[PDB]
Amino acid sequence: PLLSRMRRESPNGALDARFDRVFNAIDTAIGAAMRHNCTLDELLDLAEGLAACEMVPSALKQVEMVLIRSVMMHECSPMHLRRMLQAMFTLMRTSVPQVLLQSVASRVADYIKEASHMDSSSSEKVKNHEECEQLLELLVVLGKCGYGALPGLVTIYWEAQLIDSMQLNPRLRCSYASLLASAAFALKKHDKRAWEGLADESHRLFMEYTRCNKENDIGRFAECVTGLAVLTQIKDNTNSSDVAFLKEYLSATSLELKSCEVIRVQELTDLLGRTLEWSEALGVVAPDVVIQLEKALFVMLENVSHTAPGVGIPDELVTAACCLVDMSSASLELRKAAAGVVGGAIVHAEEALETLRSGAPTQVRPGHSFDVAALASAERENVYKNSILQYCAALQRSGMSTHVEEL
């Protein structure tokens, strides 16, 4: 925690090189401790520290092994599970170990079963809400990780429905509403018996969260918009007061963070599309927030293409540009920036094709058949050919091809 505090206080996002020896000592200590005896509290504190200060340990596998050994212990709490899952999600960046994920899923299924068996007899609704909030947080962090059976777990948790009386924080309300909406969509697709109740509950929770009309973080706003969109798609029922409240919320929400990341540019583009279609459906446009996020992403669009033309444009950025070109409710400056970046991607792909055709004789293997090597070369060319073809189609769905020709 001390190192994390110092890193945060540092002007940039990383510490000085003088602490490389400290990090090396910590890595050696972790390597020794994994073999040595270790307790659940120490493991949780270590995971919290590694989440707080970005640090990939040298082993990174003995740690998850001991986490497997500890997750199914009888002393593990739902708060311990959500804490360790948050730490592992932050470390792995949506690439958490699926063995740990499934172990946590089985543990939370057992926990919700025990909670259903106990709380009904023991009730003290607010007192049981202390553990119910921990279970809800574990479910929401599991969903943020991206577990497969999240809709089923959410359905079981709502069958328990021990989190009533809106005693939870607004962020938890919105997250639970989004989880309920996703579970309702899956239940409608597979077994539509209980979909209606889940959809109605999620709609009511979103109404309760949005009636405050306060500005919210980017992630919370995007999740709320996604939940509202999926709820409207599945239920096809809305209220005039609700749409007025949502228009007020859209007007009152702004861009809290000006930090733009090419990692999250796809999420930003998806959020922009969702907000644009939602505003078009409602009938009231909220230009301010969408304009702010559009210019925030346009900054990176300009910087990547212009500052470093020789350096390869990110493929995620290229895909986001392709996804944002074909829409019709976006600004011409964004269209121009997307055209420029996709033109840079096209010229990079053509250069790659030329270099591959020049360096082909270095991959030919005499042991292969004449068709097998031909197929390998064909696919190596066809990946680029298909990428260029789809970029050409995306540009043909707009009128910036003249800008591309000019450049």
Q: Interface with other proteins by CB under 8 A: which residues?
A: 24, 27-28, 31-32, 34-37, 58-59, 61-62, 65, 68-74, 97-99, 102-103, 106-107, 109-110, 148, 368-372, 374-376, 378-379
Q: Which helix (H) or strand (E) holds 151?
A: helix 150-160
Nearest distance from residue 37's CB to other proteins, in Å?
A: 4
Selection from 56, 66, 69 nearest residue 95 by Cα:
56
Give the dihedral of Cα atoms 74, 79, 81, 85; nearest 10 deg: -170
Backbone angles phi, psi at 165, to 5 degrees: 70, 20
| CB closer to other proteins, 2 vs 374 | 374
| CB closer to other proteins, 70 vs 216 | 70
Nearest distance from residue 43's CB to other proteins, in Å?
A: 14
| CB closer to other proteins, 57 vs 343 | 57
| Tokens standing for residue 219 | 């992630």
Nearest distance from residue 61's CB to other proteins, in Å?
A: 7
Nearest distance from residue 154's CB to other proteins, in Å?
A: 16
Q: With beta carbons less than 8 A apart as the criterion, state whether 256 and 231 touch.
A: no
| CB closer to other proteins, 66 vs 276 | 66
Chain breaks in the chain (C to N over 2.5 A) after: 123
Nearest distance from residue 272's CB to other proteins, in Å?
A: 29
Q: With beta carbons less than 8 A apart as the criterion, state whether 140 and 176 touch.
A: yes
CA 163 – CA 110 distance, rounded (Å): 17
Nearest distance from residue 146's CB to other proteins, in Å?
A: 10
**Residue spans of alpha helices (H) in 40-192:** 40-52, 62-71, 78-92, 98-122, 125-145, 150-160, 170-190
CA 33 – CA 35 distance, rounded (Å): 5
| CB closer to other proteins, 98 vs 122 | 98
Nearest distance from residue 233's CB to other proteins, in Å?
A: 23
| CB closer to other proteins, 97 vs 314 | 97
CA 250 – CA 175 distance, rounded (Å): 18
| CB closer to other proteins, 104 vs 297 | 104
Selection from 163, 169, 267, 287 nearest residue 225 by Cα:
267
Nearest distance from residue 295's CB to other proteins, in Å?
A: 38
Q: Which residues contact 30 (CB under 8 A, 6 or more apart)?
A: 46, 57, 58, 59, 63
Nearest distance from residue 89's CB to other proteins, in Å?
A: 15
| CB closer to other proteins, 68 vs 364 | 68
3-state secondary structure of 57: coil
| Tokens standing for residue 354 | 């030329």
| CB closer to other proteins, 24 vs 169 | 24
> Taking the alpha carbons of 283, 287, 292, 296 in that order, is the dihedral positive or negative?
positive
Burial 336-369 (b: 16+ CB within 10 A, else e): ebbbbbbbbbbebbeeebeeeeeeeeeeeeeeee
